[PDB]
Structure 1
Amino acid sequence: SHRKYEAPRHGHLGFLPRKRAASIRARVKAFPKDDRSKPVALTSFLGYKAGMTTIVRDLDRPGSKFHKREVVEAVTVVDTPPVVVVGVVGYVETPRGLRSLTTVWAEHLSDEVKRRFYKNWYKSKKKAFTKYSAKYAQDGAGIERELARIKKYASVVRVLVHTQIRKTPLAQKKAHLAEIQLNGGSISEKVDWAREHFEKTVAVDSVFEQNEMIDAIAVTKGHGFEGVTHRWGTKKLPRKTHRGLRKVACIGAWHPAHVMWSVARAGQRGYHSRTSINHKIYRVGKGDDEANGATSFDRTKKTITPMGGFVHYGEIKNDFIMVKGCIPGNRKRIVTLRKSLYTNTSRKALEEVSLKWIDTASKFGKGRFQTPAEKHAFMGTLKKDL
């Protein structure tokens, strides 16, 4: 017999299986289509999710009730110290997909990135890329020839980079190393761009510009085993039900004599690789200057970390990025910022955003002051002050 009353199915079937992601760092499944007219540029960056704040901006859109009016928006602050380029890999296209031809690396590898290749680094001889560096120190004994191979073949070249998490305030000390595709010029231009950038750092101000809709790729916050009621949002069973009410009542008809793949079941919630799109860049801030949170309307000497530090993260002494809204993953998590795979207009991507005031009150409670100067100016003299 048919469903007595229609209702949409609970949950998106296109996000299955709701299992734990294979790694804490989410990879970029797809990179932007390459051009040749455009110059060689990285198409992604790696940063760390620090926390969220609030901003006030003078919204302008011709036809809304809030035209030329102040709006309060949640923003996510991503701590993004410059990533170090160490290596490049060429991919040749084959009738079975892209296949990696070879990976050329850099003469000297930082101990932070070299720590990635170990699971017990302290109790090791640190023998890592030693023979590779021995192959180095000569002109092209095994380096220029491999780069020539990558130029002659390998329709796709991706630069291997790693994060500067000694600069980041985490307890990690193990650099996240990933691949960023280069999407400009020819293969020769991409390869010698990588070679020239070997052992060198690149900052976000080169990759991402202000007022840019980028994509965020991250592993969402994990929550362990969850029941169907919170994992899929199915309706709670009535109060008077033997054997529990946080269940799905009927998990299938008699025939087919199996539980279908589309019935809601309990299992792992969260910790999934997700790529969300169209997140606007609100500010590309630099740590190598004070007054990160100073706007042309505030003009107050003030960094971006709130009073008491970002909760569970700390300080943003590096470069950083203000993404509007929320992004997948929790704080302290490595996120990947990616260029958009299409050029949207929407009268929303080409909206010129200029912040008026960004909140730095303490997120560790109901914060009242933005600066300790403001706190002192309000309270006055305290007994702790002599």
Structure 2
Amino acid sequence: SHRKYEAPRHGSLGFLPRKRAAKQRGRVKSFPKDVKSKPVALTAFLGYKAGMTTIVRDLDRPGSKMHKREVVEAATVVDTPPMVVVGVVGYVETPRGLRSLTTVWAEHLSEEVRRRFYKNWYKSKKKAFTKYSGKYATDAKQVETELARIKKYASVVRVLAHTQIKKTPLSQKKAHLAEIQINGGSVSDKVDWAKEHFEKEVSVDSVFEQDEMIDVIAVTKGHGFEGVTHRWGTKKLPRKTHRGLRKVACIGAWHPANVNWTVARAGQNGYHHRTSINHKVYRVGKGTDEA
């Protein structure tokens, strides 16, 4: 027999499995599509979630009852010191997907980003990138040859940039290193832009303007193991239910003699990778600004 009454399903089947994220750093799964006619520019930036605040703003929405009237809105602060460009990666269009051909690095790396490649920095000889730093041998023609290969064969160019986490109040000293796709211009223009920006700082005001709409990639808050009642928002069973009530009463019909993948089950809640879109930029503040 059918359910006595119909009701929508609890939870979304498009965010499965509700498992922990593979990394704590949210990764850009997909970048904006490249337009050659645009100037060469970055498409992303890394920051740290500081906290929330409140603002008051005059609304410009004709036809609304709050038009030209003050509204009180929640806002989030993202601490964003300028990121340092340290590398460049070339990607090739293949019948099996994009494939990285070569990665070219900068000559000098700061200690906070060189700690990224170590689990025990204090016990190490800190040998990372020393022979590669030696690759800059005079003509540094190995580097120019690889960059020319990227220019010749790559169709997608992404830069390698890291945060300056020593400028944040965090006690962690490891920087966060990420790939940021370069959009705009020809492949040669992108490669020239990446090389000329090696070991240089790029600020947020060079990637995002105010009043822009941007997306946020992040790993959500972890809550550990959770029962179905709070993990999935299922109906609590009656107060007088034997063996407890924070359950789903029926987890399947008799046939198929298995539990379906669509049934809500207890498990780990939070710490998921999410891509959230259309967050408006109310302010791009500057650390040097005293106001």
What interval of TM-score do these two structures reach, taking the shorter chain for normalisation? over 0.9
Map of 2:139 onto structure 1: 139
Q: Which residue of 1 aligns with 2:253?
A: 253
5 Å matches for 1:289-300?
A: 289-291=289-291
Counterpart check, 1:156 vs 2:153? no
In 1: Cα distance, 2:136 partner to 2:251 partner: 62
Equivalent in the alignment of 1:232: 232
Q: Is the 8 A contact 1:26 1:273 kept in 2?
A: yes
Report matched runs for 1:176-215 at 5 Å: 176-215=176-215
Equivalences for 1:322-337 in 2 at 5 Å? Answer: none
Residue in 1 that maps onto 2:8? 8
Match of 1:57 in 2: 57
- Give 1:116's aligned residue: 116
1:142 Cα deviation after fit: 1.3
Structure 1 residue 262: deviation in Å? Answer: 0.6
CA positional deviation for 1:192: 0.8
Q: Where does structure 1 lack aligned partners over 5 or more consecutive residues?
A: 292-386
- Looking at structure 2, the residues matched to 93 and 138 of structure 1 have their Cα atoms a distance apart, in angstroms, of 33
Following the alignment from structure 2 to structure 1, what is the Cα–Cα distance between the partners of residues 139 and 279? Answer: 44
Contact 1:19 1:272 in 2 (8 A): yes
Tell me the number of residue pairs that the alignment of Structure 1 and Structure 2 aligns.
291
State yes or no: 1:87 paired with 2:87.
yes
SS of 1:284's equivalent in the other structure is: coil
Which SS does the other structure have where 2:283 is aligned? strand
Question: What is aligned with 1:32?
Answer: 32
Question: Which whole-Å CA distance do the structure 1 matches of 2:186 and 2:98 have between them?
Answer: 17
Deviation at 1:138, TM superposition (A): 2.3
Report the Cα offset of residue 97 of structure 1.
Answer: 0.1
| 1:137 shift after superposition | 4.2
Q: Structure 1: which 4+ aligned runs deviate by more than 2 Å?
A: 137-141
Whole-angstrom distance in 2 between the partners of 1:92 and 1:106: 21
Cα distance in 1 for residues equivalent to 2:202 and 2:278: 23
AA aligned to 1:223 is: H
Aligned residue in 2 for 1:288: 288
Whole-Å separation in 2 of the counterparts to 1:223 and 1:163? 27
Q: What amino acid maps onto 1:106 in structure 2?
A: A
Q: Is the 8 A contact 1:43 1:181 kept in 2?
A: yes
Quick check: 1:41–1:182 contact (8 Å CA) kept in 2? yes
SS in 2 for 1:28: coil
Q: Could you tell me the TM-score, scaled by structure 1's length? A: 0.75
Q: Which amino acid aligns with 1:276?
A: S
Residue identity matched to 1:11: G
- Please report how far the alpha carbon of residue 60 of structure 1 lies from its aligned counterpart in structure 2 after TM superposition: 1.2
CA contact (8 A) 1:107 1:137 kept: no
* Distance in 2 separating the partners of 1:179 and 1:43: 10
The letter for the 1-side match of 2:60 is: D
* Sequence identity percentage: 87
Aligned AA (2:219): V
Query: Which residue of structure 2 lines up, in the alignment, with residue 76 of structure 1?
Result: 76
Q: For 2:134, give the aligned amino acid.
A: A
Per-residue Cα deviation, 1:239-265 (whole angstroms, up to 9, x for no partner)? 000011000000000011100001000
Secondary structure of the corresponding residue to residue 73 of structure 1: strand
CA distance in 1, matches of 2:119, 2:221: 24
CA RMSD of aligned residues (A): 0.6
Q: Could you tell me which amino acid in structure 1 is paired with residue 129 of structure 2? A: F
- Give 2:216's aligned residue: 216
1: distance between equivalents of 2:289 and 2:68?
30
Task: Give CA deviations for 1:76-107 in whole Å, capped at 9, x if unaligned.
Answer: 00000000000000000100000000100000
TM-score for the superposition, normalised by structure 2: 0.99
